[PDB]
Design a protein around this ligand. Structure first.
Ligand SMILES: Nc1ncnc2c1ncn2[C@@H]1O[C@H](COP(=O)(O)OP(=O)(O)OP(O)(O)=S)[C@@H](O)[C@H]1O
Ligand SMILES: Nc1ncnc2c1ncn2[C@@H]1O[C@H](COP(=O)(O)OP(=O)(O)OP(O)(O)=S)[C@@H](O)[C@H]1O
Ligand SMILES: Nc1ncnc2c1ncn2[C@@H]1O[C@H](COP(=O)(O)OP(=O)(O)OP(O)(O)=S)[C@@H](O)[C@H]1O
Ligand SMILES: Nc1ncnc2c1ncn2[C@@H]1O[C@H](COP(=O)(O)OP(=O)(O)OP(O)(O)=S)[C@@H](O)[C@H]1O
Ligand SMILES: Nc1ncnc2c1ncn2[C@@H]1O[C@H](COP(=O)(O)OP(=O)(O)OP(O)(O)=S)[C@@H](O)[C@H]1O
Ligand SMILES: Nc1ncnc2c1ncn2[C@@H]1O[C@H](COP(=O)(O)OP(=O)(O)OP(O)(O)=S)[C@@H](O)[C@H]1O
Lengths: 298, 298, 298, 298, 298, 298
C-alpha cells in the first residue's frame, strides 16, 4: 500500500536511466531540468515552457497555420538571443522575411546572418556548419516544407530530414545552439527529434490585434501540454509588456492592490495601461523585472 | 440424442484446457470469467463488456476513425482507475492531449504520468518498465500508427510490435495493469494479442453532442459482439449519468414508474432530466448506484 | 462402334475404384451421390449444388471479393443447420460478425459457439476438437487469410494449412460435420482438399438489393460448373422465398398459370409478389414446400 | 558437286531410321506425315500445323499468357472432336471452366467428361486410365502449373511429370487419343515429350475482339515455325468463318473476283461480310467447304 | 643475348610439334593458319577472327546473355554459308527460331534443315550423322543448356558432352563443317574443345538499335583476345554495310577523302550514309568489295 | 646461459644444411638470400617480399577471391619483366585476358606469348617446354582450378599437379624463369612447391578505386608473414607512384619536410599529389628512384 509509491519512482528512474531525464514525468511535476534557455520575450510562454524559454543544444519546432505567429515568435527569440549578446542565423527557403518588421520585433537586422539555399540538403548542411562553429546562439529554419530535395529540382525528403536531423541532433546536443524549425500546417523526423513543439494559431476575431494560442504539445525538458494565449498586434508583435505586468503582478514581483500597481515600494501607475506604460518608459526597469521573473521561473 | 449435448461441453472443456478459459463460448452465455476490471464510466459499456469494464492484466485495443471517441473513452478509463486510487500513465506519440478536457473527463492531470518517446521501440520499452513495476493501473498508448521504428527515422514495425507485444503480454498477464492501445483506422500483432477490441465510431448527425456506437468486436473474457450507443457531448464526453439512470432503472436498482423515478423508497424526480439532475447533485448517491450496478453485472 | 461406349464407362469405374465416386463424371450427369446435406436456404443453389446443399463430412470453400455474399451465405447455412436442430460453431479471426444481421438471417445467436483464436494453428486445432466431438453440424472459419501462423506474430502457413487440412480431412470424412472456409480473394491446400468451392460475387448495379452470382467452380459430389444468380438485399440477405416460389413453380410443386399461382388445389395469389407474400404468412407452408423441393432435388 | 545432294538425303534417312520420321526436315518441306488429326476449327491453323489439326496418339502443348486464347483453342478442338462423333475429357485443376462459353464454342457440355483431381499424380493417373480405354478422342489437362504433387499438400513435380509423361507417351502413341496440356507462362518434361507446341498470345489493341498470334514453335509431325494470326472475339471465340472464307478463297475452293465471291458456279455474296454471312446460314455448306479445305491440306 | 631469340622460336616449334599449330603464339602475330572459313557477314569480326570468319572442321562457341546477339550472329553465318552455295542445319532444343527474322538476316529458310530432338544424346547424335555426311557446311546447336540428358526426363550431361564432343571433334576435323554451339550465360567440355569462343553481349543504351561487343576470348586458329563493337538493329541484325564501308575505307579498298567516298576511280557518295546507301543499291558492288576485303584479311 | 645462443644458430645451420637456405629463420631477420628477382611494380610489396620482387627460378602462387587483384598483380610483374628486356608467356585456361587493360598496366601485348591448352597436362607440358628454353622470364598460369585433366573431358589432377610440379620444379630451379600460378579461392601440391605464396583480397569499401591487402603467407626466400595494403583503381591497377613516393620518402631517397617533397637538392612539389604528379611527368626520374629503392631493399 506504500511500497507501491516506491515502485513508481523506481520505474521512473529506470526509464530515465535507459532513455534520459524527461523520458517520463507527472504532468504537474516541477520541471527543474538543468538546461540553458533563450527567452521567447513573453514571460508567460517562458513559464509555460517550464524551463524559461526554448532549450539550447536542442531542436524546437514551431508549427501551425500561416499568419498564426510562428515567424513572429521565432524572430522574438532571436531578438532575445541578440540582446543577450548572441549571434543568430536565419536559413530562408521561403523568401518572405520583412526586416522592417523584424526590427520592430527587436531584431538587429544588420548582424543577422542569412542564407537562402538551393536545396534542402544544402540548407541542413549550412545549418550544420554554423552549429558546429559553436558560436551561434539561434538558427531559424524557414520553413520545413520549402526544404525541397536537390534531385527533385520518391519520398527522399522524408529521408533527407531523418538523415540530416539525426546527424544534426548529435552534434547540436553540445553547442548551446537553439535550432528552430518553422512548420506550416519530413515533419515526422522532426516530430520525434524535436525536444519542444509549439502549436501556434490565432483564435477568435481580430480587433490590428489578434489573439494566438500557443500550446507546448511536446516538451522533453519540462511538463508538456501547458498553453498560453498572447496578444499579437500588427507591426508590433506579441504584447510582451502586458504579459510581463500581468505575470510579475501574479508573482508579487510587482505589487498590485485592486487597480493600483507598485514596484520597489513605489507606485508606478493605476490600471494596467498606465503601469505597462510606466515600464515602457524605463528600459532599466523592464529588464530588471524581466530577469526577476526569469530567475523566479528558473 | 442427448449424449450429444455432452460431447459439446466436453469439447468446450478440452478446447479450454488446451487454450484457456474464453477460448470458445456460446454468444448468449453468461461471462463470469474471474478477472479484475477498470470501469469505463459508462455502465452499459461495462455491461456489454460482460465483465464490468476493461480487464486488468490484459491488452485492450480501442480503434476506429479520428474524432470517433477513442481518446475520450481511454481518458474516461484512467479517470475511473484514478478515482479508485490507482496510478495511470499515458504514452504519447501523437502530441494531442488536451489536459483541460482530460480534467473535464475526471482525470487527475497532475498525477498522470506522461511519456513522449523518440521511437516505437522506446515506447514499448517504457511501457514494459512501468508495467513491470506492478504499481501501474492503466497505461494508454497513443497511438499504434505513430509508433514508428527507430531505424526508420522494410516492415520492421510489424515485427517490432510482434516482438515487444509478445514479451509485454507474458509479463502483463500478472500485474493488474490494464494496457490500452489506441488505433486510428503492427495492428495485426495487436489484433491477436488483444483480449478486447472496441470499435468506436460516430453514427448519424450531431446535435454539440454526437452518438457513438461501440462494439466489442473481440472479447476473450466474455461473450463478444455486444454493442452500445452512447452520447458524446463536446467538452463533456460520454453522458455517464444518462447511461447510469437508464441502466439502473432497467435493473430495478432505481425504481421507475412511468415518468416517475425513485431510489431508496424516496422519489428523486419526474423524467430522466430531473432524475439525472438529482443524482448530479449527490456524488454519494451517484457512487452508490454505480457500485450497485457494477456489483450486479459482476 | 459400340464396345466403345463400354470402354468409357469401364474407365470411369476404374477411375472411381482408384480415386472414389465423383472422381470423374459427365457434366450433364445426374448426381445422385449418397451424402448428407445442409441446405443453403436458397433452393436453386441447393439444386445447382446437385445434392441439395453443402455436403456433410466434407470441406466447402466459399470465396470471392469482400461484400460479395460469402458471410451471408455461410450464416444462411448455419441458420439452416440450427433450424434442423443442429449445433454450429463460428471460428472468427476477422472480428466482423454482426449478430443482429445474423439473427435477421435466421441464426440463433445465443446457441452459436464462437471462438476467436490467437493464431492459425490454434484455430485449426479448435476446429479439430469440435469436429472430433461428432456433435457439431456446421463449423465456419472466417477467414482463410486472417489465419496467420503463431511464430509469425517463410511460408509456414501454406504448410500449416496443408498439415492441418490433411489431418482434419481424414477425421471429418466421418462426422456429419460440414466445414466451411470463407476466403477473401494456404488456399492452395484448400483448393484441393475442398469437395465444393463456391465462387460468390456481386454482378451489375445495386437497386438496397444487389444480385450475386454463385458458381460451383468445384464439386466432387455432383456435376460442377453450375451457377445461380440470387438477390441479396441489405439487412435481409438472399431472397429465399422469391427463389422458392420460382423453383417450386417450375417443378410444378406450386402450379402457375400465367400470373396465377396455386398450391394444394387452392389459389394462393396472383403474381409473384402476392404469392411469395402468401407463403411469408404461413411458416407451415413455406417449410412443406421447402421439404417438397428438397426431396425432389434429392 | 552432285553426290553431295545425295549424302544429304542419306543422312536425313539415317537420322529418321535412328530417331523416326520428323526427326529432321527442311523448313519448307511438304509435311505429308501419315497421322490422324483433330481440327482446331480454324483452317489456317490446321494448315499451319501442316497435317491439318493436332496429331492423335501424340501430346500437344498449348502455352502462353493468361487470357491469350489457350483455353479457347483447347475447347475449339474438343468441339471439333465431338462433332466428328468423338468423346472428350477435361482434367481440371484450375476450376475456371465456363460451360456457357464452352457451348458458345460448340462443345457438347453434357457429354464432356470432367475430372477435378486432388493432386498431380492423380490427374496423370486419371489421364492414363482414360487414354488406355482407347475410346477417348481428346483429353485436355488444365493446367500444367496447377498439377501440384500429392506430398506437397524438393522438385518432385519435375520428376512426377517426367515419370508419368514417359509412361503416358508410350501407351498414347497407339490410341488415337490427342492429349492437350495447357501451360500458363515440369514443363521441361513436356517441352521434350510434346510433338507439337503452340505459342498463343494476344497482339495489339482490342476492338470485344482481339487478335492472337499462334506459332508452331515445335512440330515433330510437320515443318515447325509457321504462324497464324486469328481473331478472338469475346464470348464467341476465334472467328472460324472469316478464316474459312479467306483460306478457301485462296485455294480457289470458293472463287473470288474482286469483291465477288461464289461457290459451285453460284454467287454467294459480295464482300467477305456478306459471304461469311451466306455460309453462316448453311451448315451443309460450311461443313462441305470445311472438308474440302481439310482434304486439300491433307 | 641473341641465341635467346632463337631458343624462343625453338620452343614455340616444339610446342607446336607436340600440340599442333596455334598451341602458342604472340598476341600481335599475323595469324596465317591455313583453314577454310565461313564469313560472319561483318568483315570487322572476320578481321578480328584473324582467319576471316569461323573455321571449318572446328567447333565454335558463341556465348553470353540472352538478347545479346548470339542467335543473330549464328544465323548471319548460315546466311553466309548458304549464299556461298552451302547447306546448313539448325539443331533446336530452344523452340524460339523466328523464320521471318531469319529471312531478314538473309537465311534461305526453306532450305534450312531443322531438327528438334527429344534429348541431348539425340541432338549430338543427329549432329554427328549430318557432319559425317560431309555435305553440311554449318550446323548450329541451340542451345547448350537446353541439351538435357535422356535419363533425366547426377551430372551426366557434363559427361554426355565430354563423351560426344570428343567423338564429334575427331570426325569433324575433316569435314569442312563449321559447328556452332550457342551458350546462354557441359560448357566445360565445350570450353576446351572449341577452337573459337565468342563473347557476345550488348553494351550501353539502345537507340531500335543496340551496340554489342564481341570478343574472341578463345582462338586456336589466330591470335585471341581481339574485339569488335557492332550495331544490332531490331529486325535487321548487325549493320554489315556500315561495317563494310568502314573497314574497306580503312584498307583503301574504297577511297575516302574527308567526307568523300569513291570506288573504282568513281565517286560513290559523300558521307557514310550516302555511300553505304550507294552500295546498298548494287549487290554486284557489295559482293565485290566483300571479296576484296575477305581476300585482303586472308 | 650463453652457449645456448650457440646451439640455436648451430641447429639453424644443420637445418639449412639438410634442407637448404630459408628452411628456418627468425621472423625479424634480414633476408639477404642471393636470388634474382622480378619487381611487382609496387616497391612496398617488393620490400615486403624481402628480396625485392618475386624470385626467379622458383614458383610463386598468387591466390584469393575473384576480383581481388591476382591477375592485376600478375600482369604488373610481366610488365616489369618486359621493361627489363625480358620475354613473358601467359598460359590461359580461363579465357578472360583483357589486352587493353594489360596495356594499361604496362604490358607489351604484342610480344606477350599466349597459349590456351586443351587440358591441364598440356598446359604444364607447354610450361615445361618454355622454361626449358631458358629464354623465358615470366610464365603466368591462369588458373590452377581451370587446369582440368585430359581424361576428365577420381582425383587425377591432384596427382597431375604433383607429378608435373615435381618435374617442373627441378628444371626451373636453374632457368631464371619466374613461374606464377594464379589460384581462385591440386593446390596442395602447389602449396608445398611454391617458394612464395601471396594472399590477395580487397578490404573495405570501394571509392573506382579499392584497397587490397597482400600478405606473404609463405616465403622460403625471406621472412614470411609481412603484408602490404595497396590501392587498386579501376582500369589503372595498383597505384605504383603513390607507393613509390611514400616508400622513397621513408627511406630518405626523396626528402620530405612536412608537406614539402624534394629530390636531388631540388624541390619537386608540395603534398603527395603534386609530388607523385611531378614524377609522373619524368620517366627518367621515376625509373631512377625506382632503381634506388630496389637497390636499397637489396
Ligand atoms: N511584415 C509584417 N508587418 C507587419 N505585421 C506583420 C508582418 N508580418 C506579420 N505581421 C503580423 O503578425 C501576424 C502573423 O504573421 P507571422 O507570424 O508571419 O505569421 P506566421 O505564423 O509566420 O505565418 P506565415 O505562413 O509565416 S506568413 C500577421 O497577421 C500580422 O498581424
Ligand atoms: N479537447 C477537446 N475539447 C473539447 N471537446 C473535445 C476535445 N477532444 C475531443 N472532444 C470531443 O470528443 C469528440 C471525439 O474526440 P476524441 O475522442 O479525441 O476522438 P478520437 O476518437 O480520439 O479521434 P482522434 O484521432 O484521437 S482526434 C470530439 O469530436 C468532441 O466532441
Ligand atoms: N451487418 C450487416 N447488416 C446489414 N446488411 C449487411 C450486413 N452485412 C452484410 N450485409 C449485406 O450483405 C452484403 C454482403 O455482405 P457479406 O456477405 O458480409 O459480404 P462478404 O462476401 O462476407 O464480404 P466480407 O469481406 O466478409 S465483408 C452487404 O453488401 C449488405 O448488402
Ligand atoms: N467465359 C468466357 N466468356 C466470354 N468470353 C470469354 C470467356 N473466356 C474467355 N473469353 C474470351 O476469350 C479470351 C481468352 O480467354 P481464354 O482462352 O480462357 O484465355 P487463356 O489463354 O485460356 O488464359 P487463362 O489463363 O486460361 S484465363 C478472353 O479474353 C475473352 O475475350
Ligand atoms: N525475331 C526477331 N525479330 C526482330 N528482331 C529480333 C528478333 N530476334 C532478335 N531480334 C533483335 O536482335 C536482338 C538480339 O536477339 P538474339 O540474337 O536472339 O539474342 P540472343 O543473343 O540469341 O539471346 P537469346 O537468349 O537467344 S533470345 C534483339 O534484342 C532484337 O534487337
Ligand atoms: N579488364 C579490366 N578493365 C578495367 N579494370 C579492370 C579490368 N580487370 C580488372 N580490373 C580492375 O582490377 C580489379 C581486380 O580485377 P583482377 O585482378 O582481374 O581480379 P582477380 O583477382 O584476377 O580475380 P579474377 O577471378 O581473375 S576476375 C577489378 O575489380 C577492377 O577494379
Amino acid at each position: 500500500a506504500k511500497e507501491r509509491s516506491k515502485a513508481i519512482e523506481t520505474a521512473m528512474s529506470q526509464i530515465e536511466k535507459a532513455f534520459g531525464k524527461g523520458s517520463i514525468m507527472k504532468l504537474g511535476a516541477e520541471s527543474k531540468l538543468d538546461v540553458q534557455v533563450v527567452s521567447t520575450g513573453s514571460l508567460s510562454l517562458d513559464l509555460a515552457l517550464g524551463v524559461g524559454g526554448i532549450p539550447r543544444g536542442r531542436i524546437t519546432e514551431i508549427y501551425g497555420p500561416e499568419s498564426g505567429g510562428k515567424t513572429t515568435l521565432a524572430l522574438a527569440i532571436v531578438a532575445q538571443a541578440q540582446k543577450a549578446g548572441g549571434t543568430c542565423a536565419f536559413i530562408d527557403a521561403e523568401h518572405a522575411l520583412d526586416p522592417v518588421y523584424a526590427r520592430a520585433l527587436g531584431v538587429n537586422t544588420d548582424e543577422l546572418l542569412v542564407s537562402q539555399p538551393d536545396n534542402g540538403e544544402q540548407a541542413l548542411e549550412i545549418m550544420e556548419l554554423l552549429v558546429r562553429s559553436g558560436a551561434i546562439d539561434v538558427v531559424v529554419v524557414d520553413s520545413v516544407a520549402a526544404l525541397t530535395p536537390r534531385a527533385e529540382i520518391p519520398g527522399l525528403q522524408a529521408r533527407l530530414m531523418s538523415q540530416a536531423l539525426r546527424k544534426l541532433t548529435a552534434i547540436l546536443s553540445k553547442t548551446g545552439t537553439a535550432a528552430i524549425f518553422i512548420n506550416q500546417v519530413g515533419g515526422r523526423a522532426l516530430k520525434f527529434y524535436a525536444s519542444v513543439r509549439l502549436d501556434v494559431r490565432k483564435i477568435g476575431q481580430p480587433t490590428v490585434a489578434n489573439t494566438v494560442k500557443i500550446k507546448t504539445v511536446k516538451n522533453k525538458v519540462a511538463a508538456p501540454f501547458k498553453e498560453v494565449e498572447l496578444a499579437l498586434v500588427y507591426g508590433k508583435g506579441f504584447d510582451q509588456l502586458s504579459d510581463l505586468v500581468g505575470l510579475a503582478a501574479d508573482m508579487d514581483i510587482i505589487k498590485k492592490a485592486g487597480s493600483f500597481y507598485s514596484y520597489g515600494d513605489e507606485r508606478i501607475g493605476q490600471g494596467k495601461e498606465k503601469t505597462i506604460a510606466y515600464i515602457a518608459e524605463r528600459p532599466e526597469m523592464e529588464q530588471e523585472i524581466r530577469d526577476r521573473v526569469m530567475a523566479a521561473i528558473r
